[PDB]
Ligand binder design. Structure first.
Ligand SMILES: CC(C)(COP(=O)(O)OP(=O)(O)OC[C@H]1O[C@@H](n2cnc3c(N)ncnc32)[C@H](O)[C@@H]1OP(=O)(O)O)[C@@H](O)C(=O)NCCC(=O)NCCSCC(=O)O
Ligand SMILES: CC(C)(COP(=O)(O)OP(=O)(O)OC[C@H]1O[C@@H](n2cnc3c(N)ncnc32)[C@H](O)[C@@H]1OP(=O)(O)O)[C@@H](O)C(=O)NCCC(=O)NCCSCC(=O)O
Lengths: 429, 429
């Protein structure tokens, strides 16, 4: 009897996995996975295997996998609006469940996210009073912190629930959070760039992406398509990234999903992380200020490097090859906006940057990452407020980080608390 | 010629250390410090040596050390107001510099923090509109995020400064942040619990703690003393703790000091972390609701344990012995509030809890931690709004986390980005 419900599905799945991890441990907990060196310690845990994170795994060479699903694979397997790009909704189901959802599953997330999307008055209020020189990311992060008012987990914890049920309240507070995000994100949008206008209402019959674009104010049918791919691809990127790890870390301490996502956002906002979004465009934007020669393009990159700055959108802590998310984006451009002069500059940089980066002999991965290609796409559709780009990244990222958060709690992962050491201490060791 | 200035001192100190870490590495980077097992991975990096963090080191048995200075040591060596408890100001100098400051050094932080303490209008505004059911910690964290408007590092980065100078803008934005905190913290205080009143102005001639207590509204001379010790002891606790690690992690991505501290706060707010402050009092507060027998005290602890809850204020991820911060606090009570019935209950719990915790056979460290003893002290002085306690923790914590943040950047520590692994992947490995 009956119909769709992620939670019932999860209820069936938790005990299995719990079991599976206990036996594995019972036999392998003692197993050495790896060693820790000094350089690793001074180096940002680079190359250290430090966390269990289920939803996605990043391969240095091939790039990210949602189960074991690649981006090309997702593209073909995940349900679509009607109609070429994958619905982040179906992405979400996959991440949570390990399985490819049916259209019918997918429609259910959509409605669910539609039903839950509602903002409390104190939040609307704060957003409406924020100054316009407060960065969109700051605005977003303070809003999500402020939503903690409403945390179902915060409240259940205060009532004393058994630790076993944590995952259930997490899940609710995840689903409500994902639901609200686009509203928050769009409110910021409309306040800063469309002053006096309103975000409008959520239509239960649309997919999350589409409601998002309406709230943003965009009509173009291809924009919507852009949005669906963008929000799916930015999903998740394993557990070690600043944003995800931040969530995992904060969430480990039993801070509710709102506080943990917000902290994640503060991490996403750093230049070496998701703000690279934004930095890309600005650098591109200066480049053109200062149709160029590869040689003048090259002088320009050198001048950055010489100046003690990074080239934004290039390099990666884990990837060692061109990001497939980059390829993914390129391939969208080539289909849709192949004559765009911004696009063409990005295409030409691809010819030059890595070469310059090899020449310099510093970057371990001279190839571009997702950030190098995302803004170009946005600008094209008219969304040219580049200090806002990272917000979009932030909305997508909720998908992966929250899908995991639920599992961490389902699995009972304890407090994240490694040991630190000072230089003198290490010197002594 | 000339007078005091932390920054000139740091300018002299950075190059030395830079040098010292390069040679050490040159000879030891390859050295294996440790191994990683499966259990560690599933276990929250427990026992993994994962970070370099200079300011303080925690010993499992003896407890925390500021250089190599113990709490008792600090107590005797750090300058005092006039007059028994150490000035957090002098703590700060120690952490940053490695050296014990002179009174004269100490007076300089004080004035400096006094000069810089000023809140921008959009912040005051948001705090004044926040609802009273928004938790103080949430309020604090959203306020600090919102201050990023003002980040000197955010602005310098946007202008393109050479990476080498980062530490300098960090330092400014650290000193301004520490300066403002008590204002923010007190504004929250006054809005929630003292509605219609005002925090008043900062008097350059007082020490930070004392301005803080005036802003809070407290007159008692011993309260002030309490505040100075409280804010010094809560300083720092090595790099691995959720709050510090969060800052270190977010800061690694070149998010400004404001965003990184705020994220740290979201971590501090979880029940297994700094909110334990608060949880302690509430549990104590229910205990008494429900002068008891050790046996009834024991039934009560069992009922918690049986219920799938933790006993707040007991246990630790690293400490294996009674926290000296706990002893520190106890010893303050015994001097000042030895007949306080709350104090006496906490003293009696000390007799029972660990025993019950040993009996159960789960907790690796059955002894109490700082949180078990802090609120008791506050309540005594009239500060009995326990959902506010963690704010105080948060203000102190700024001291250690920011003192480090400056060094991370001075030392050029890269992006924190370890590798994650899923269960299937590990199973495969
Ligand atoms: C992403 C990174 C932080 C990875 O950092 P890492 O793993 O420490 O890099 P690495 O191992 O190649 O670093 C070796 C050296 O190369 C330098 N280097 C690496 N990437 C670059 C870059 N794009 N421009 C110039 N220098 C660079 C790096 O700064 C370091 O210099 P130094 O030894 O003086 O500190 C780095 O490539 C970078 O700063 N890239 C530019 C910022 C960027 O595009 N960020 C987005 C990352 S992925 C998508 C997202 O996160 O939003
Ligand atoms: C601080 C801790 C999170 C350390 O966590 P840990 O290193 O994973 O603890 P551990 O190695 O002893 O855990 C072994 C088991 O003992 C359980 N345990 C440990 N501490 C306690 C406690 N105080 N009450 C009941 N159960 C406990 C722990 O939950 C785990 O149970 P299970 O295996 O079902 O998950 C834990 O002791 C705890 O939850 N304490 C209560 C909360 C608290 O007082 N927090 C403040 C910590 S220090 C000051 C600050 O951070 O603000």
């Amino acid at each position: 009897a009956s119909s769709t419900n992620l939670k019932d599905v999860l209820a069936a799945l938790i005990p299995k996995e719990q079991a599976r991890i206990k036996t594995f441990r019972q036999q392998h907990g003692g197993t050495a996975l790896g060693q820790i060196t000094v350089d690793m310690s001074y180096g940002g845990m680079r190359g250290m295997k430090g966390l269990v994170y289920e939803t996605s795994v990043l391969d240095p060479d091939e790039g990210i996998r949602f189960r074991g699903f690649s981006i090309p694979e997702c593209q073909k397997l995940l349900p679509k609006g009607g109609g070429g790009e994958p619905l982040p909704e179906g992405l979400f189901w996959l991440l949570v469940t390990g399985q490819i959802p049916t259209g019918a599953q997918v429609s259910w997330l959509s409605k669910e996210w539609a039903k839950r999307a509602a903002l409390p008055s104190h939040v609307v209020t704060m957003l409406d009073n924020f100054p316009t020189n407060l960065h969109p990311m700051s605005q977003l992060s303070a809003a999500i912190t402020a939503l903690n008012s409403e945390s179902n987990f915060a409240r259940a914890y205060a009532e004393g629930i058994l630790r076993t049920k944590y995952w259930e309240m997490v899940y609710e507070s995840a689903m409500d959070l994902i639901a609200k995000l686009p509203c928050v994100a769009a409110k910021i949008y409309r306040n800063l760039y469309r002053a006096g206008s309103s975000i409008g209402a959520i239509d239960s019959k649309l997919d999350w992406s589409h409601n998002f674009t309406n709230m943003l104010g965009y009509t173009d049918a291809q924009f919507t398509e852009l949005m669906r791919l963008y929000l799916t691809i930015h999903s998740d990127h394993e557990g070690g990234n600043v944003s995800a790890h931040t969530s995992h870390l904060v969430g480990s301490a039993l801070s509710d999903p709102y506080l943990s996502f917000a902290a994640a956002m503060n991490g996403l906002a750093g230049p070496l992380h998701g703000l690279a979004n934004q930095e890309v465009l600005g650098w591109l934007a200066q480049l053109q200020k200062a149709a160029g020669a590869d040689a003048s393009l090259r002088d320009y990159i050198w001048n950055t490097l010489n100046s003690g700055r990074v080239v934004p959108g290039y390099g990666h802590a884990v990837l060692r090859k061109t990001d497939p998310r980059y390829t993914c984006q390129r391939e969208f451009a080539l289909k849709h906006l192949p004559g765009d002069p911004m696009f063409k500059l990005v295409a030409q940089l691809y010819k030059i940057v890595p070469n310059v980066l090899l020449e310099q002999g510093a970057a371990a991965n001279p190839w571009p990452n997702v950030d190098a290609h995302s803004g170009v796409l946005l600008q094209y559709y008219g969304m040219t407020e580049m200090n806002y780009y990272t917000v979009l990244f932030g909305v997508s990222r909720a998908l992966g980080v929250l899908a995991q958060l639920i599992w961490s709690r389902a699995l009972g992962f304890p407090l994240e608390r490694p040991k630190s050491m000072s230089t003198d201490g290490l010197i002594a060791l």
